[PDB]
Design an enzyme around this catalytic site. Structure first.
Site, mmCIF file in Angstrom:
data_model
loop_
_atom_site.group_PDB
_atom_site.id
_atom_site.type_symbol
_atom_site.label_atom_id
_atom_site.label_comp_id
_atom_site.label_asym_id
_atom_site.label_seq_id
_atom_site.Cartn_x
_atom_site.Cartn_y
_atom_site.Cartn_z
ATOM 1 N N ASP C 347 -59.124 -5.783 40.337
ATOM 2 C CA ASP C 347 -57.767 -5.267 40.432
ATOM 3 C C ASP C 347 -57.292 -5.160 41.865
ATOM 4 O O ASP C 347 -56.532 -4.275 42.208
ATOM 5 C CB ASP C 347 -57.579 -3.939 39.666
ATOM 6 C CG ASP C 347 -58.869 -3.153 39.493
ATOM 7 O OD1 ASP C 347 -59.239 -2.896 38.328
ATOM 8 O OD2 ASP C 347 -59.499 -2.785 40.511
ATOM 9 N N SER C 372 -53.769 -4.161 46.262
ATOM 10 C CA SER C 372 -54.525 -3.277 45.383
ATOM 11 C C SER C 372 -53.625 -2.762 44.274
ATOM 12 O O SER C 372 -52.664 -2.066 44.547
ATOM 13 C CB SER C 372 -55.085 -2.101 46.175
ATOM 14 O OG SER C 372 -55.363 -1.000 45.325
ATOM 15 N N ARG C 373 -53.931 -3.103 43.028
ATOM 16 C CA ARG C 373 -53.113 -2.647 41.913
ATOM 17 C C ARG C 373 -53.218 -1.116 41.662
ATOM 18 O O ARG C 373 -52.450 -0.559 40.883
ATOM 19 C CB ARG C 373 -53.414 -3.445 40.623
ATOM 20 C CG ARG C 373 -53.385 -4.973 40.727
ATOM 21 C CD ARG C 373 -53.546 -5.656 39.340
ATOM 22 N NE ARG C 373 -54.490 -6.790 39.323
ATOM 23 C CZ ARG C 373 -54.242 -8.015 39.812
ATOM 24 N NH1 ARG C 373 -53.069 -8.278 40.384
ATOM 25 N NH2 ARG C 373 -55.172 -8.980 39.748
ATOM 26 N N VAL C 374 -54.163 -0.437 42.305
ATOM 27 C CA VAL C 374 -54.304 1.009 42.123
ATOM 28 C C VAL C 374 -53.313 1.630 43.053
ATOM 29 O O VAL C 374 -52.591 2.555 42.703
ATOM 30 C CB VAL C 374 -55.705 1.513 42.529
ATOM 31 C CG1 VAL C 374 -55.803 3.037 42.413
ATOM 32 C CG2 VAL C 374 -56.751 0.851 41.677
ATOM 33 N N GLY C 375 -53.334 1.111 44.265
ATOM 34 C CA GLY C 375 -52.302 1.343 45.236
ATOM 35 C C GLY C 375 -52.185 2.739 45.762
ATOM 36 O O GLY C 375 -53.160 3.358 46.154
#
Ligand SMILES: Nc1ncnc2c1ncn2[C@@H]1O[C@H](COP(=O)(O)OP(=O)(O)NP(=O)(O)O)[C@@H](O)[C@H]1O
Ligand SMILES: Nc1ncnc2c1ncn2[C@@H]1O[C@H](COP(=O)(O)OP(=O)(O)NP(=O)(O)O)[C@@H](O)[C@H]1O
Ligand SMILES: Nc1ncnc2c1ncn2[C@@H]1O[C@H](COP(=O)(O)OP(=O)(O)O)[C@@H](O)[C@H]1O
Ligand SMILES: [Mg+2]
Ligand SMILES: [Mg+2]
Ligand SMILES: [Mg+2]
Lengths: 167, 467, 510, 484
Positions: C347, C372-375
């Site tokens: 991710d 970063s898809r969590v971000g």
């Protein structure tokens, strides 16, 4: 693991692999000959008008084909330690193959005995001897008693040659 | 025991054994040859048969020919009496000087120096070749690799390396030509007898030669490198010595492996190399190393198939290096030999805490400006040069100077260049560039840095070209 | 070919005679053939799929193909030690590895054995390398920071705990350093007093040379990082199945900390080289080749592994495993089979580039491609309130970079973005092995992102940040250490910062 | 004496018998057809038929020869034209083949040799100055089709007249010319070309063409090698030209695939490298202790659209001691012979020229790889400093020099003549569009006047301040006599 009696005929490399087995399975109990004849017989227990409805039949399968080959072994002149080369071809699905497995059993048997070179025009010299082309002469005495580029190529062309005396 | 050939294709002979099935790797003996033929065992197909690679051509063999289980892996004339002597794939001498005389022999198929034997000490080996020392210095006793497409100066470099590094060296050197040109072996023998690192008379020879060139079978080439390193592995582990091992060309090892792989029963993998290109390399680079017991500076030269640095062969080789000099066709084509890509070449010891902030800060500054010049490169040459900044015509100017001052007349290349050889001590290299970089020669014209030695020798050509 | 293994002579003969080696080949078998690390075996008629077997000569092996007439076994070690005939034996073996704290500081091999030459590992526990990952429900949304202490990353490419961020780039671009420094930075938490913030590090070396893994551990030791790091290592000359396995061992040893309310970070350096190994086994096992000759399960391979990092909800310990896999790309091709796969599974990506590297950008993180898809969610509030802006500004700086050159005379409006841009950019440069604390980071970014650095020559910035950082760290350990524990940038801390930044610059460039 | 045929198709005969046949040993067929063993397998010998396998049928008889394959050798071959097995095909009745060498000979190892020092002249200004060959060298001619790849190798043999019709027994060079894959219509038209110019006399011409069987092209360049191995192993000088290895490789591929040897890149077989490697090593410069004799080899490769990544072209380049590239682009542009200096290399450098050439062109190969790049940088009409204004002001004229006619070599002496004209700067002030009507005069003017100077340089192969001095006027005595 077991060591193997590879008898100097060897034969195959890929398929009649069962054959190359029993010159080594036999050569322990010296029952080579007990089978040399046993197989000759089975070769026709299967070429019956009564055995081809399984011989080439993926219909019955490894069920009633192996335990229906406790018959054509136990019953007849067999039931030894060679009722099994069948019980294998039976399971390992290669009953459709045995003829070739017997064929080679021979050509490997008659190289412990006979020699196979043949005459020119007819039958087998069976020179069963300790020396090749020794008895090739003394056994065919029972046979009596029973130059311009092109012409070069056209003379060897009759000598040991062509379609002539071949027939 | 005794075995009989069952089948033969090209370079792969299967053999059958009555009793004594030889373990994989076990060298086997072909009975009946006018010259010795060994068959390194490679697998057990079963039914007491073993497939094998031949360490020479199988022209002549016949189904049933007599083969004898030599009982153990190929073994060679490891030992001190190899110096000045041209060995080969299987030990046999071939300079024509009758048996190599030693009573110590080692199999060429060893295991590899375990974790705990690893040495972590690295110190800068200066080569006097400016480009390498400035931007990617080699390290005493470390794995070095020379990357190159065909004809870019890979082999010449390794000569000027064995000339410089291996002459002012009082230890032992082992040069092993795997798979390349036979002409080039003969060529080196005699240069290395003119210099007399090989001396035919006394016993002052400092150089073992192992050879297996592009004229030999895949069997040979696949193992020539296994031999030449068994040779240099002795001089390490024993002496505690400083062994210089040169190979040319470690590529031919995987290629050779390729040629037989097919006939060995392998679905091919990507680019059609062996499914084993990876580990084949591993359990073999992992031997060309430096233990606590001894040290081996290694200088391999790698062919890059078609210049594609991603071709699974040169690609996998990179992991196994500590310092890599990568050669560029586009640079060579501009006449800038040695065609080292100052932006694809790398050393592990290019650390300011290892080479000092002066060195480091100076290398990286050169690397930078060359990179910046590369960036202006398709603005200018298609949209008017003088359309550049003031800052930029400046970073172009200096760059092209820096870029040329990076060339060197090599001593083994006088035949080509036309200038007498050269060689610059590390600190005059750092200084030279530091200057050019600093703006101290923006007045001298380009060609003055092209192919000179120490920086001053450019101020020389600076007037010689003038009046 | 037509025939079939087992079926010939050696074996054939004896089905005629009458062979009776007790173990009807259930518990054992014998080698029908062996080459290239594959050992075809008769019998073992009771082995399970993937079981571990022992060779007569002592070697270890794994049962990957259970074919009808033979077991195909892959050899954990050099195979000169195997020959046609050798008896192979079910050991009732579970492929499991040593687990728990007793590994920190150690260097084991792919299977768990010390190789640091420091003798026994007091492994109180064993865990199987082959395990399903936590499903949907055992989990809660990644939110706690996993701070690498690298300015580029912690601001523009946040990683959280439970996340799988991918370090991906051409060779020789600093992929491994990104991992190293991350481990190093972990210490400041491990030597503090907050358990919630400690992080235990497994670093799995696959396929590299020993002279390297060694070097590596020396560096991790000099930083005194080894004390909270396990180093699993299946090096270049180790056999295939070892390399194939190593990462799952590594995952298992961290998966321990995860399931005991603790927090682990695992690095798989290099997940491309593991693929290669698995490929090799698949090919010699004669399994259908696909793209690049990789199997149809070389996705399934990595997705089994990487889906095993997670963040367990409270009800399960609260623990976490976080994975930084590392992929080597060729000529930057991130559409190749393996890159594609991993990039797909993970991710986030941190892409590193060689031109960046030499231009000066070190670490060489392409902040445009990286993601970063969590971000934001993985970031502390302080960081969030400067990083946000920075991101945006660099983004604009990017849109207008062209006019750097052919733009020494353009709308004073965009002359601006260029300036801010190059400056922000200088702030993201960072030296090696020098991981910064988050509050420190927020400070030095705050400086630039708020203007204050705009009238300083770019050159000097890396020096200014160097001295400015130092000044506050010894002096205002006050409301620095306060920026950290409070988490945010207080209405009040904003000002005590503007005071220190502007007045310090003042005197700096004077 | 030998046995059965199991099956036949596509030039591949399986044979059940021959139990004591050597691998690589040639068998013979019922119909009188020479075959060859290559696959010695358990239960059969796969044999590559050396001709039309229509005559073969299941069951035929195959008989051993005992011999590994071999061919006719020696001067009794010169002037002839033989197929791949040595047989004559120019209809002039057999050759006097007392000498019979084996094809499958391995190459000379390290000791039997000595650094390549002996100038192998091509009579092509372009080659003899910037990429000079020497006796024992392998120099590859590579290029797209119809670029001039052959008019190189031909112009070179046609150059060896001069030496072979004289006294000096070292300067003599006997020529073999393998012709793999081509069409007879051409092989012929080519012999005719040799014959006319009168060179055919010193020149074997082995020819295995399009219609010839597959193993016959496989083998051809080897055969033609053995024939050239003799000339070296017996103290004389050979130049063999394989034209071309590209077509040969293709042939080897066929055999290999039909033999069921699993295919590799571009379908070729694994050893497709070994193939060209081994063949091409067999050319060497034997050391005195072995004859002093040589075998220079010009292999020829043909590229597709210029792609030198193609499996083969990359292999052969890695093998030879350098190469000449061709390029249709330059060709039509006027640069005939189209060469691409900057991309052509000779890995033997000056070590293979006269000290006469060396002095006019020894650092002009690294000059036309910088004047190159320094006219591609300042292509546009602006300004450049005092240093790089001249390099261009020169080169344009210089290139007009290596522009050369066809089927008209030059003797090294004359080459040094014109090269001198420019290199020393006696042309540095002339409009390029004339630099040809010029040379075509100044060289027939200094053959009609000074057979003198040529005499020296030709013989001692150098330009002493003596020779040089004479030149220094004969030149000058011409520029002022035309323009000024
Ligand atoms: N932040 C940095 N600043 C300056 N130099 C750096 C920095 N980070 C890494 N390097 C240098 O870059 C080099 C190699 O980077 P590395 O961490 O090995 O990336 P990599 O992708 O693993 N290359 P490789 O493992 O060989 O495929 C080292 O010698 C470092 O000293
Ligand atoms: N120096 C030259 N000047 C003018 N024309 C030339 C010159 N050299 C060759 N040619 C012509 O160009 C053509 C091609 O020459 P050639 O030697 O057959 O190249 P090639 O690549 O070998 N052709 P091919 O055998 O089909 O591949 C001829 O028909 C010539 O007459
Ligand atoms: N040090 C050099 N200086 C000038 N030219 C060089 C130098 N090194 C190599 N070259 C040129 O490159 C050519 C090929 O060199 P080589 O090292 O043999 O290529 P390879 O890398 O395949 O072994 C030379 O013949 C030469 O003309
Ligand atoms: Mg070379
Ligand atoms: Mg790395
Ligand atoms: Mg042609």
């Amino acid at each position: 693991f077991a060591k193997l009696v590879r008898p100097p005929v060897q034969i195959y490399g890929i398929e009649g692999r069962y054959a190359t087995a029993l010159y080594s399975a036999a050569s322990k109990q010296n029952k080579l000959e007990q089978v040399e004849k046993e197989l000759l017989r089975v070769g026709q227990i299967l070429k019956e008008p009564k055995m081809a409805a399984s011989l080439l039949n993926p219909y019955v399968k490894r069920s009633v084909k192996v335990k229906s080959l406790s018959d054509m072994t136990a019953k007849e002149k067999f039931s030894p330690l060679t009722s099994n080369l069948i019980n294998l071809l039976a399971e390992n699905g290669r009953l459709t193959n045995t003829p070739a497995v017997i064929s080679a059993f021979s050509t490997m048997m008659s190289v412990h005995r006979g020699e196979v070179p043949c005459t020119v025009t007819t039958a087998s010299a069976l020179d069963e001897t300790t020396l090749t082309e020794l008895k090739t002469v003394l056994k065919s005495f029972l046979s009596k008693g029973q130059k311009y580029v092109d012409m070069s190529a056209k003379t060897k062309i009759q000598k040991l040659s062509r379609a002539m005396r071949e027939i | 025991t005794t075995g009989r050939i069952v089948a033969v294709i090209g370079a792969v002979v299967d053999v059958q054994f009555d009793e004594g099935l030889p373990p994989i790797l076990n060298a086997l003996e072909v009975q009946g040859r006018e010259t010795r033929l060994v068959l390194e065992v490679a697998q057990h197909l079963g039914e007491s048969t073993v497939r094998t690679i031949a360490m020479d051509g199988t022209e002549g063999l016949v189904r049933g020919q007599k083969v004898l289980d030599s009982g153990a892996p190929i073994r060679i004339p490891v030992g001190p009496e190899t110096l000045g002597r041209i060995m080969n794939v299987i030990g046999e001498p071939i300079d024509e000087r009758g048996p190599i005389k030693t009573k110590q022999f080692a199999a060429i198929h060893a295991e590899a120096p375990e974790f705990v034997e690893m040495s972590v000490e690295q110190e800068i080996l200066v080569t006097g070749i400016k480009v390498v020392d400035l931007l990617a210095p080699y390290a005493k006793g470390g794995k070095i690799g020379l990357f190159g497409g065909a004809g870019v100066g890979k082999t010449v470099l390794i000569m000027e390396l064995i000339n410089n590094v291996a002459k002012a060296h009082g230890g032992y050197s082992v040069f092993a030509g795997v798979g390349e040109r036979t002409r080039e072996g003969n060529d080196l023998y005699h240069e290395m007898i003119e210099s007399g690192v090989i001396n035919l008379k006394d016993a002052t020879s400092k150089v073992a030669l192992v050879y297996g060139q592009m004229n030999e079978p895949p069997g040979a080439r696949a193992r020539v490198a296994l031999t030449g390193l068994t040779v240099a592995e002795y001089f390490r582990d024993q002496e505690g010595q400083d062994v210089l091992l040169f190979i040319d060309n470690i590529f031919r090892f995987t290629q050779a492996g390729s040629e037989v792989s097919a006939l060995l029963g392998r679905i091919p993998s990507a680019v059609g190399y062996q499914p084993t290109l990876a580990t084949d390399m591993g359990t073999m680079q992992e031997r060309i190393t430096t233990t606590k017991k001894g040290s081996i500076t290694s200088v391999q030269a790698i062919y890059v198939p078609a210049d594609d640095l991603t071709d699974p062969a040169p690609a996998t080789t990179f992991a196994h290096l500590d310092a890599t000099t990568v050669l560029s066709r586009a640079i060579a084509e501009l006449g800038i030999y040695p065609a080292v890509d100052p932006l694809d070449s790398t050393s592990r010891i290019m650390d300011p805490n290892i080479v000092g902030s002066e060195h480091y800060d100076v290398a990286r500054g050169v690397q930078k400006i060359l990179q910046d010049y590369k960036s202006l490169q398709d603005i200018i040459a298609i949209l008017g040069m003088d359309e550049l900044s003031e800052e930029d015509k400046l970073t172009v100017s200096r760059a092209r100077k820096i870029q040329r001052f990076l060339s060197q007349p090599f001593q083994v290349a006088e035949v080509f260049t036309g200038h007498l050889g050269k060689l610059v001590p590390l600190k005059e290299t750092i200084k030279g560039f530091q200057q050019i970089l600093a703006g101290e020669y923006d007045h001298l014209p380009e060609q003055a840095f092209y192919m000179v030695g120490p920086i001053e020798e450019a101020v020389a050509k600076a007037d010689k070209l003038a009046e | 070919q037509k025939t079939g293994t087992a079926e010939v002579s050696s074996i054939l003969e004896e089905r005629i005679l009458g062979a009776d080696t007790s173990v009807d080949l259930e518990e054992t078998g014998r080698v029908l053939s062996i080459g290239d690390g594959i050992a075809r075996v008769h019998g073992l008629r009771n082995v399970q799929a993937e079981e571990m077997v022992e060779f007569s000569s002592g070697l270890k092996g794994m049962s990957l193909n259970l074919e009808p007439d033979n077991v195909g076994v892959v050899v954990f070690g050099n195979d000169k030690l195997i020959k046609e005939g050798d008896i192979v034996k079910r050991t009732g073996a579970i492929v499991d590895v040593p687990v728990g704290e007793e590994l920190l500081g150690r260097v084991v091999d792919a299977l768990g054995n010390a190789i640091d030459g420091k003798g026994p590992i007091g492994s109180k526990a064993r865990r199987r390398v082959g395990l399903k990952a936590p499903g949907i429900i055992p989990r809660i949304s990644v939110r706690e920071p996993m701070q690498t202490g690298i300015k580029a990353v912690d601001s523009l490419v946040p990683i959280g705990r439970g996340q799988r961020e991918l370090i991906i780039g051409d060779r020789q671009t600093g992929k491994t350093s990104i991992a190293i420094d991350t481990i190093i930075n972990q210490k400041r938490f491990n030597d503090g007093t907050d358990e919630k913030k400690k992080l235990y590090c497994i670093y799995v070396a696959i396929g590299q040379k020993r002279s390297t893994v060694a070097q590596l551990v020396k560096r991790l030791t000099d930083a005194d990082a080894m004390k909270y790091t396990i180093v699993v290592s299946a090096t270049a000359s180790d056999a295939a199945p070892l390399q194939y396995l190593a990462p799952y061992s590594g995952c298992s040893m961290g998966e321990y900390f995860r399931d005991n309310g603790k927090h682990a970070l695992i690095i798989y350096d290099d997940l491309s080289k593991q693929a290669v190994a698995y490929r090799q086994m698949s090919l010699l096992l004669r399994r259908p080749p696909g793209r690049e000759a990789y199997p149809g399960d070389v996705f399934y391979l990595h997705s089994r592994l990487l889906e095993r990092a997670a963040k367990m909800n409270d009800a399960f310990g609260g623990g976490s495993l976080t994975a930084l896999p590392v992929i080597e790309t060729q000529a930057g091709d991130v559409s190749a089979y393996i890159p594609t796969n991993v990039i797909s599974i993970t991710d986030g990506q941190i892409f590193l580039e060689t031109e960046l590297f030499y231009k000066g950008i070190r670490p060489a993180i392409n902040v445009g491609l990286s993601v970063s898809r969590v971000g934001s969610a993985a970031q502390t509030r302080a960081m969030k309130q400067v990083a946000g802006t920075m991101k945006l500004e660099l983004a604009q700086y990017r849109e207008v970079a062209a006019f750097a050159q052919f733009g020494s005379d353009l709308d004073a409006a965009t002359q601006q973005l260029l300036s801010r841009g190059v400056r922000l950019t200088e702030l993201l440069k960072q030296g090696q092995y020098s991981p910064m604390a988050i509050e420190e980071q927020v400070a030095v970014i705050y400086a630039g992102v708020r203007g204050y650095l705009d009238k300083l020559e770019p050159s000097k910035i890396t020096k200014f940040e160097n001295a400015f950082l130092s000044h506050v760290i010894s002096q205002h350990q006050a409301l620095l250490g306060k920026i950290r524990t409070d988490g945010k940038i207080s209405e009040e801390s904003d000002a005590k910062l503007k005071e220190i930044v502007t007045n310090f610059l003042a005197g700096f460039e004077a």
